[PDB]
């Protein structure tokens, strides 16, 4: 099938993935959080965190 | 009810003739029988 | 020009007019590096394939970018060398894996792989795509065999040239 | 014992499984696809087939 390369960016940080072109976004938007953070906490830089209430 | 109160103070049962609709809720532990386990754990409180 | 950066490998830099950076790889590789020309947010300038031997086989990728098309890339980073340098362990991790291996040099060893170009003469080809491992085979001391690519518009487009001697 | 439940994506869809949480990816991704085809033959999705060479 189908998938992306793309970039991400987030928490001062920019990191390249694949992402599962035809797949809902709310299908892998945890995932994803869990990987940025993941390579933030190996990076040594503050993970991502929910402020509150939001999405 | 699955986010403010836990699954050791209120739980949860559907009773459905549509369990398709209902096929998220496997995931909630609120929904996990204590009493009968199986392969995935706790059993899944929805009956048809 | 040298940089170290969050990173991962030490990379040096050349600049003139404009930077310039190589990576050597070490039977054919893809040809397929022409989609690398247009990163996520960079945009260089040329992919040059060089290659240089007999005997002292050596293949290179040399690399330019101009900063002043990439100004809106290097505003977002803390340096435009650490842009490219970024940008060529990008492409030097994706070449990396295979049989053939991929590191930036550093510029001591650019300036080495300057004079080993150099060591001390024919037409450029219109059409290429078959000839390279046959324009290897003329008899010389050295031999010096190299293809550039360009974004003449979004597609990129292909030219080669030689040197014997 | 304990056992992930896990939600594997595969040509579009997303299965649900039980897999053992102590034993290797390579032991238990042997029975794995065949329960993924099964299931995709059972939504009636052409089966996951592999082409030239990998794992």
Same mark, same amino acid.
Do not use: C
């Given at each position: 099938?189908?998938?992306?390369?793309?970039?991400?960016?987030?928490?001062?940080?920019?990191?390249?993935?694949?992402?599962?072109?035809?797949?809902?976004?709310?299908?892998?938007?945890?995932?994803?959080?869990?990987?940025?953070?993941? !390579?933030?906490?190996?990076?040594?830089?503050?993970?991502?965190?929910?402020?509150? !209430?939001?999405? | 009810?699955?986010?403010?109160?836990?699954?050791?103070?209120?739980?949860?049962?559907?009773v459905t003739s549509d369990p398709?609709r209902?096929?998220?809720?496997?995931?909630?532990?609120?929904?996990?029988?204590?009493?009968?386990?199986?392969? $995935?754990?706790? $059993?899944?409180?929805?009956?048809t | 020009?040298?940089?170290?950066?969050?990173?991962?490998?030490?990379?040096?830099?050349?600049?003139?007019?404009?930077?310039?950076?190589?990576?050597?790889?070490?039977?054919?590789?893809?040809?397929?590096?022409?989609?690398?020309? *247009?990163?996520?947010?960079?945009?260089?300038?040329?992919?040059?394939?060089?290659?240089?031997?007999?005997?002292?086989?050596?293949?290179?990728?040399?690399? *330019?970018?101009?900063?002043?098309?990439?100004?809106?890339?290097?505003?977002?980073?803390?340096?435009?060398?650490?842009?490219?340098?970024?940008?060529?362990?990008?492409?030097?991790?994706?070449?990396?894996?295979?049989?053939?291996?991929?590191?930036?040099?550093? &510029?001591?060893?650019?300036?080495?792989?300057?004079?080993?170009?150099?060591?001390?003469?024919? &037409?450029?080809?219109?059409?290429? &795509?078959?000839?390279?491992? *046959?324009?290897?085979?003329?008899?010389?001391?050295?031999?010096?065999?190299?293809?550039?690519?360009?974004?003449?518009?979004?597609?990129?487009?292909? &030219?080669?040239?030689?040197?014997?001697?």
């Amino acid at each position: 099938p189908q998938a992306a390369v793309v970039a991400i960016m987030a928490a001062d940080v920019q990191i390249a993935v694949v992402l599962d072109a035809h797949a809902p976004i709310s299908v892998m938007i945890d995932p994803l959080l869990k990987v940025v953070n993941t !390579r933030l906490r190996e990076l040594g830089v503050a993970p991502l965190e929910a402020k509150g !209430r939001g999405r | 009810l699955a986010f403010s109160h836990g699954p050791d103070h209120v739980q949860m049962i559907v009773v459905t003739s549509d369990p398709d609709r209902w096929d998220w809720v496997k995931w909630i532990p609120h929904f996990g029988d204590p009493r009968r386990r199986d392969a $995935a754990g706790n $059993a899944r409180m929805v009956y048809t | 020009d040298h940089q170290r950066r969050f990173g991962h490998d030490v990379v040096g830099i050349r600049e003139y007019q404009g930077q310039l950076v190589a990576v050597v790889t070490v039977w054919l590789p893809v040809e397929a590096v022409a989609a690398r020309l *247009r990163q996520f947010d960079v945009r260089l300038d040329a992919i040059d394939i060089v290659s240089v031997g007999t005997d002292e086989h050596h293949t290179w990728l040399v690399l *330019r970018m101009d900063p002043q098309r990439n100004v809106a890339a290097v505003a977002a980073r803390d340096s435009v060398a650490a842009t490219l340098a970024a940008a060529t362990e990008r492409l030097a991790h994706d070449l990396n894996g295979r049989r053939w291996t991929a590191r930036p040099l550093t &510029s001591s060893e650019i300036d080495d792989m300057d004079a080993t170009v150099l060591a001390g003469w024919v &037409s450029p080809r219109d059409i290429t &795509s078959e000839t390279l491992e *046959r324009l290897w085979l003329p008899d010389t001391e050295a031999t010096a065999v190299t293809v550039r690519l360009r974004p003449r518009h979004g597609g990129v487009e292909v &030219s080669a040239w030689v040197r014997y001697h």
